[PDB]
Homo-oligomer: 386 residues x 4
């Protein structure tokens, strides 16, 4: 059928299948997973690799020998399975010291600690072979207006990303940063709340080339945005450094459902885009198996993430390969969208009477776009009705 | 009391108090307003100026002599009142020829016409003294996935903004462009849907300095975003070229309520930001008097736009001037947010044991932020309870 | 593939395929359709019937003799095709006299007119064979707080529906009323905004049995609610008199996409529910072909409505018939949910030590619900990957 | 300024000021509070009473004698302060045995336990003097479609509330039940998601009169609904048994901000309604002090709750008492909305030519409703600019 192999580049965070089920209104429904057991179970499922936050791999406050021992046994599981670590990140949101943020905390001593905690994990991530380092600022934001001056907070966020870029340049590390946007939760509003705000921010950093975005399906959907459209803008800007896949069923709390769940047609158009644009990075799943599930349901949800990408990849590829669909695209003039509007230049456009004075606006206005026929061919292919 | 004068820089679009009340489910409840009568009534109210779309001033399809006559009588009303025209824009969304967009229409001949219609109105706007030219692409987008290839559509949008920049540079015009973001409506999803996506886009134009954003209160609120936060990012980037003020009561269709209505606390924090950042541009109202109203209610709604800005400007200025509030800000460490995190540099931060190895995380974690006290002082000032 | 037959009970309103394309920001993209041509084209497509608002069949303001002729043509087209008229409604939202509503307008004379316009259309619907009469109070509500006292307006809404009940009872008509809820648009907030609010209101009417709901897929999704769950509560209450099918992509303006589009997994769970509950009323499509389409695009979108109901009907029937799904439902204890909690009363429950004193809370807490495996089987059936 | 007195009937749950700060992405920022210290601090602040979940007063799993002592301390603090206990509820959401719900769990033995845990707390609430018993089915629902048959789960929900009704009737207790709706979180979709759905459900119970609603400001705003409108329908139905006050800034996770924050104009219209309808139950605050605050920040936020109710009470009373507002209501025909539409029946309506044949539709269509002038007077009163 649709069996994942390492060649598909599917990756999972330690915190995803390892989530215990504690939420805002309830306690853990599952026991803690050992990182070593997660590496082996995921390898058996056909995953290509794993990612971590520092505190997922090493308990907060571990002494250096406890730290040594956690990394050592993690690395032996990696080597024994052939599993890779493509990405890593810092937890700057769980501990109560981060209750007003990490990099933009109002307290200056807490911003220095957040930067020291992050550099320590950049060194370890590079050792394990990570090529992308993610920054998700879940606690950077506010619930009230005078609590955070946002222009000065953006000065502190730029200062912190510029310091991290100076550090990896001076160490000569081959590692890139990717910002993960989220509109809200756990703060009332988070800074750089969508893909577009993170892309604009990057352009003001001292070394913009070192930074890109790591968008999450459900986060852009919490602001009611079109995730395929946000991803196309990121790819148009050359900034899609990584991507987090999951499901979300509308504007509400962050659900992190398994990929395919939530908005199924957006998942289809996202796979169509990634595959036709030739995205070559990891297909990473940041989801949380519902707390109704035991450990057998945890691996069934994680296996469903990979299966749904592969069914959808197949349906999108049959769609674009269908001659009838190719005909429908010409009918809807998707080939004329690819033509330059005025490669003849502005002066030639201004002198062209068929562009304005002799343009028949009502004949143009009457041409049907034939978009409903095209979308029902896309619907038939997704459902396997062709 | 709180009487507006031209010194307050309040401006209104011809289409706002001139809206007739036709919506998706209903016909006009009001007669058309003459542009000349709008200029005089707004001047009597204490407005500073007016803005227009080309088709508001000159009926679509007017011959050049009809065109001449409309502009001539408009300009005599302007001169007779001392009213200015700070901004102007193109209508690229009403006529059925724009049903798939203007600059990103799949049809190439329609993209050339959209660019010719826009250049014609740039010439007229500069004559009338407009310094900002707005582009609101309400029809650039899609209701379905294969209908619009978004990377090629962004190539057509960049091509069109680069052609407009070449044109005004070659004419030597002193005029800037400002992009107006909107998430959806009338398309299922619109391209560059928020302030952040428009700011990121600008950085890929050939002449980025010629372009900025013109955010609208209710549009960022349709994606559930914090409008004061979006505005602070625009000001941090030096890109707030203009601003459209109105009210919106949540994520639903675009209401364009009078400013102050909708989210009242966001309106207060927006005025606090504009006034403390020293924004010097027009305070423009793009709102629509509810269709329940007659022409007397139209001028009462428009007068309420200006009154609510002035009451709020006064409350925010009393807030920041209160010694008790200034004390509360120090208590919440808003002064330490202004201090550089590590001006001592990365190597000095890495050697600083108090930033990590000797940092007392639990003492830091226990410091209360005192943000609820600060926000209740902001609440008492807004309500005049102090 | 999958052809509609009259036995499928698919129906469409005159206003759906007849929408000309005007929206809040644009003029009509299509010509008006003649009702008799709509009846013919729909019968050729395999629909079973049509519905109408009085102003869709007879132009507002028609004399008794212009009325006569409109009605005569229409009934002639019906007779000729064998098309039925299952439901009808009144337009109490388009004309500007209804700008503050119809049954709950503040002006008493407007409330009286609204009731007289409605009774006139009830007599016509009854001779054409309609068994359901729909009420969509699209203008009942407000944009501001003191503009409507909602307790007194519910008094006027109750009085209106009680006067309609008295009237159909004294004429001995076999017609029933169905309320269509909608949360907002065109009013800032509409009265009876969801299925739940309409169901509760019905219980305070003089004759509750004459009244039920006509829920619409996209309206409950404009409040972010689960449409299948709302339908299940209406069926549990014995009040699903009719249903309106279409698609909506999230919380935003009322889109009226063709059925199947929008939230596709919710369309699958709705067809599964309607078919397993054996609902036997019409499957009515209230949608609007995108204004990007010409008339050929209209009939393609109207036929895609029916095709998507039929594909989903077949996928849901395959899901429920699969032995492995039936085993998965037993494993998630869907059979045990159907067993009464305490059929021997509360004194037998209070005496039972296994229900409290001796209940092993931690062993019960540790059972997995096996919900992700069941939902991935559901996912494989929808995509035809099973 | 504006001090709370016991006559104001302000109450708070033990869980509100006692929230320790754990959220989905972080650990507790504050220490647990002792109930007797909460009762004392709240009595000093001028509150009138406290509420509780059984697991807030007695730790889950306490023996009968640990129960004994918890209860004894608490009642001693109450006796000493004169604090009342107006309402109580059961925690059927925190413990992992409730991961698929309590009354509608798929497992029958879990449903039985849920009912036994609830009855145990009803006997205690009745001896402490509670006259309202709240049900918040936070775990009743699902993240996926086949995981819950909603018609059968409404059967189990009805059976549970009928068993509770039989029990309080056979004990002769004077307690009434109130259902708190919530649309989602922690479940993907919760059953009875809004005030309307809870009101309709009550009408199918064996003894409807024992049951009403306990609506919460932030929960109806998570569906984008108008909370004052929902409250008005509950008061119209005679079912507002209790209310929960707090703030929410839009559709997103349940924030539980202090009352006054969030949507401030909706808080103003809610106090105006509660005070003009003469609602006499408790004004209960169910909120969570932000986890950014220490314990001093907790009591500052709890006192800001009461202060904002009292300022708004005074602004609303001033709005309604102003002669000019009373003249503006007459001008918007708020008096005419209170007059019956057709008090002489439908045959007098049918005979009346002024209601249809001779009604001048265009002159009625042309009356302005004067709603913006009335809403700006409302705006001036809230801001104390009048
Ligand atoms: Mg997430
Ligand atoms: Mg707008
Ligand atoms: Mg609709
Ligand atoms: Mg809550
Ligand atoms: O996440
Ligand atoms: O707008
Ligand atoms: O609709
Ligand atoms: O809550």
């Amino acid at each position: 059928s649709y069996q994942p192999t390492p060649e598909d580049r599917f990756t999972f965070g330690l915190w995803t299948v390892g989530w215990q089920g504690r939420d805002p209104f309830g306690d853990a429904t599952r026991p803690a997973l050992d990182p070593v057991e997660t590496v082996q179970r995921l390898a058996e499922l056909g995953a290509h690799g794993v990612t971590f936050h520092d505190d997922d791999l090493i308990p907060f406050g571990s002494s250096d020998t406890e730290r040594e021992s956690h990394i050592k046994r993690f690395r032996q599981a990696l080597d024994a399975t052939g599993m890779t670590v493509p990405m890593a990140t810092t937890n700057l949101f769980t501990h109560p010291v981060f209750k007003d943020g990490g990099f933009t905390a109002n307290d200056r001593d807490v911003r220095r600690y957040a930067l020291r905690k992050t550099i320590r994990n950049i060194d370890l991530a590079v050792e394990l072979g990570a090529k992308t380092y993610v920054a998700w600022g879940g606690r950077e934001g506010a619930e009230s207006g005078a609590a955070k001056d946002v222009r000065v907070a953006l000065d502190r966020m730029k200062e912190a990303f510029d310091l991290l870029g100076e550090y990896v340049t001076s160490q000569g590390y081959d590692t890139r940063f990717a910002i993960k946007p989220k509109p809200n939760e756990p703060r009332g509003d988070i800074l750089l709340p969508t893909v577009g705000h993170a892309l604009a921010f990057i352009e003001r950093l001292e070394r913009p080339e070192l930074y890109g975005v790591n968008p999450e399906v459900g986060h852009e959907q919490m602001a009611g945005l079109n995730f395929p459209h946000g991803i196309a803008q990121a790819l148009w800007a050359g900034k899609l450094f990584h991507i987090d896949l999951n499901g979300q069923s509308g504007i509400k709390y962050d659900q992190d459902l398994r990929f395919g769940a939530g908005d199924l047609r957006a998942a289809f158009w996202l796979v169509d885009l990634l595959e036709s644009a030739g995205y070559e990075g990891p297909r990473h799943f940041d989801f949380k198996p519902p707390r109704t599930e035991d450990i057998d349901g945890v691996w069934a949800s994680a296996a469903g993430c990979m299966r749904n990408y592969l069914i959808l990849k197949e349906r999108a590829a049959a769609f674009r390969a269908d001659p009838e669909v190719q005909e429908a695209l010409r009918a809807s003039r998707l080939d004329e969208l690819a033509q330059p509007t005025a490669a003849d230049g502005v002066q030639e456009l201004l002198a062209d009477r068929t562009a304005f004075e002799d343009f028949d606006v009502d004949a143009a206005a009457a041409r049907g776009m034939a978009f409903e026929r095209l979308d029902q061919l896309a619907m038939d292919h997704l459902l396997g009705a062709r």
